């Protein structure tokens, strides 16, 4: 029942989801500014123009982290504030802002865990094909160099990318995220250039750092299970597992792209010369796992690639947007520990969305979210007992925020955000986490 004494306990956010202040202090335009201002792309007509106003109110966010007794904060730096043209001169005012914020976090006893790329690509780079162009990978590494030079005296733990599968597949193939393209070949090309950017950035950061850094990447991983043992359903599960998980894990581990997926994608697969694969496999100091859900797969030959459909289980709990399956967290961690070389591991996101409301008493009675945390934390204890080298846990999210294509309508916070007044309030599940952590 006890976690290690030095375990990292945090909450996580991303810059475009919380900051607002989209035109302040020289910030450039990102693909998400363009996309959210495009009619019909966001479910509720909202944008990130204001969001939680955390560019101005980060002190309130620090107050919440302190009230919860956390010891770390995972947040992202907005590339458009640092290099507004994507490739070009730096904006010193952007770096100064994050320097102050880091000092405020350290002054409060909170370790910063910084994500460099959490989806807010500068629009000028997208005008030159975005992640469809190798040049974007090069200039991403330049941005990483710039930020580490100025903040790496104080921040040791850095992640290059958050969820490249989403950036590539939701942004360039399925069209539901920015920039909103709908082309498989472009999505797979983007996946390669994201991984190449990661590898180039790791090398650049190590050369630029004023002290040794602990560099990782953050992947969303979905444990996949066949709905039956038929050859068709087992193959569907392998395809889905390749599509989401192995496509990214294998090249990072020095194993190339998985051959079964290369065969399946055929001519749409990217051209990956061996020089690139060597860069992609740059050694990492940790891996971040974002865990939300499993996939129970059935063969779906008429469906779109990867021709696998989810088989809902109505007997399991559901949140506002997902099925709850805590045991999948144990399964995926054991798989990583046994089958892949990455260690140590952090859970860089885990959380749930509910239709939260303020009750008459003023609290938010989010019992399902409390139960969600309790069940997932129990699975971490099981993983630790099996020898998995897990070093921390970050709840998604510190506060309700702009949840991408769902807008302000999907509340994932442990703190409730009133989007009209910008007041934050701790939900009951946040008080449960506070008290659980204090007991550790």
- CATH number of the domain within which 233 lies: 3.20.20.80
Resolution (A): 1.2
Domain that holds residue 337: 1-440
The kind and range of the H/E element at 299 are strand 295-299
Return the SS3 of 254.
coil
Are the beta carbons of 369 and 427 closer than 8 angstroms?
A: yes
Does residue 163 carry a catalytic annotation?
yes
For residues 102 and 205, give the distance between their C-alpha atoms in angstroms, rounded to a whole number. 18
Q: Which residues contact 209 (CB under 8 A, 6 or more apart)?
A: 148, 149, 152
Burial of 34 (0-12, 13-18, 19+ CB in 10 A): middle
CA-nearest of 381, 372, 361 to 413 is 372
Q: Kindly name the residue from 19, 163, 323, 403 that is annotated as catalytic.
A: 163
Bond preceding residue 397 cis, omega within 30 of 0? yes
Cα(345)–Cα(289) distance, rounded to whole angstroms?
A: 7
- The stretches of 68-118 forming alpha helices (DSSP H) are 79-82, 92-107
**Residue 426, both tokens:** 């701790």
Q: Is 360 known to be catalytic? A: no
Give the up-direction half-sphere exposure of residue 76: CA atoms within 13 A in the CB hemisphere. Answer: 26
The answer to whether the CB of 407 falls within 8 A of the CB of 51 is: no
Which residue spans within 118-211 are E strands per DSSP? 157-162
Please give the sequence-ordered ranges of beta strands (E in DSSP) within 142-228, or none if there are none: 157-162, 214-220, 224-226
Number of domains in the chain: 1
Q: How far is CA 74 from CA 49, 136, 155, 201, 318, in A?
A: 21, 25, 11, 19, 26
Dist. CA 87–CA 92, nearest whole Å = 14
Q: How was this structure determined?
A: X-ray
Rg (CA), the chain: 21
Task: Check 126, 293, 323, 349 and give the catalytic one.
Answer: 349
> What's the Cα-to-Cα distance from 8 to each of 69, 152, 204, 295, 395, rounded to whole Å?
11, 19, 27, 28, 11
The β-bridge partners of 114 are 75, 158
Residue with tokens 């994500």: 115
**Cα 243 from Cα 308, distance rounded (Å):** 10
Q: What is the dihedral of CA 201, 202, 203, 204, to 10 degrees?
A: 40
Structure tokens at 72: 């770390």
With residue 416 as reference, give the H or E element that holds it: strand 415-417
Contact status, residue 158 vs residue 214, Cβ threshold 8 Å: yes
Residue 225 tokens read as 């299970």
Q: Tell me how far CA of residue 339 lies from CA of 291, 294, 335, in angstroms.
A: 18, 19, 6
Whole-angstrom CA distances from 65 to 44, 339, 377, 408, 414 are 29, 35, 19, 21, 10
């Amino acid at each position: 029942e006890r976690f290690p004494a030095d375990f990292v306990w945090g909450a996580a956010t991303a810059a475009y989801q919380i900051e607002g202040a989209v035109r302040e202090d020289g910030r450039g335009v990102s693909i998400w500014d363009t996309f959210s201002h495009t009619p019909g792309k966001i479910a509720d007509g909202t944008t990130g123009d204001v969001a939680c106003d955390s560019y101005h109110r980060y002190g309130e966010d620090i107050g919440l982290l302190n009230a919860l007794g956390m010891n770390a904060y995972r947040f992202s730096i907005a590339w458009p504030r640092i290099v507004p043209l994507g490739a070009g001169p730096i904006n010193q005012a952007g770096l100064d802002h994050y320097s102050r914020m880091v000092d405020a976090l350290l002054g409060a006893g909170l370790q910063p865990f910084v994500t460099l790329y959490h989806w807010d690509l500068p629009q000028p780079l997208e005008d030159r094909l975005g992640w469809g162009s190798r040049a974007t990978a090069t200039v991403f590494a330049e941005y990483a160099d710039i930020v580490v030079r100025q903040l790496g005296d104080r921040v040791t733990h850095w992640a290059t990318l958050n969820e490249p599968w989403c950036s590539a597949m939701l942004g360039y193939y399925l069209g539901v995220h920015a920039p909103g393209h709908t082309d498989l070949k472009r999505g797979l090309e983007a996946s390669h250039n994201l991984l190449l950017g990661h590898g180039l950035a790791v090398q650049a950061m190590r050369a630029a750092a004023p002290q040794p850094l602990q560099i990782g990447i953050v992947l969303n991983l979905t444990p996949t299970y066949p709905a039956s043992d038929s050859p068709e359903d087992v193959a569907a599960a392998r395809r889905f597992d390749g599509f989401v998980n192995r496509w990214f894990l294998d090249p990072l581990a020095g194993r190339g792209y998985p051959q079964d997926m290369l065969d399946y994608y055929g001519a749409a697969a990217p051209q990956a010369n061996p020089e690139d694969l060597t860069q992609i496999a740059a050694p990492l100091d940790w891996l971040g796992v974002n865990y939300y859900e499993r996939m129970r797969a059935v063969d779906a030959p008429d469906a779109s690639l990867p021709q696998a459909q989810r088989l809902d289980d109505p007997d399991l709990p559901h949140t506002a947007d997902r099925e709850v399956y805590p045991e999948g967290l144990y399964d995926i961690l054991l798989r990583l520990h046994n089958d892949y070389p990455f260690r140590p591991l952090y859970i860089t996101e885990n959380g749930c969305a509910l239709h939260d409301e303020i009750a008459e008493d003023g609290g938010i009675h989010d019992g399902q979210r409390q139960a969600f945390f309790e069940a997932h934390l129990a699975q971490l204890q099981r993983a630790l007992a099996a020898g998995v080298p897990l070093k921390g846990y970050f709840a998604w999210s510190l506060l309700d925020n702009f949840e991408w294509a769902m807008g302000l309508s999907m509340r994932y916070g442990i703190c409730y955000t009133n989007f009209e007044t910008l007041e934050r309030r701790i939900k009951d599940s946040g008080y449960w986490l506070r008290d659980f952590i204090a007991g550790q």
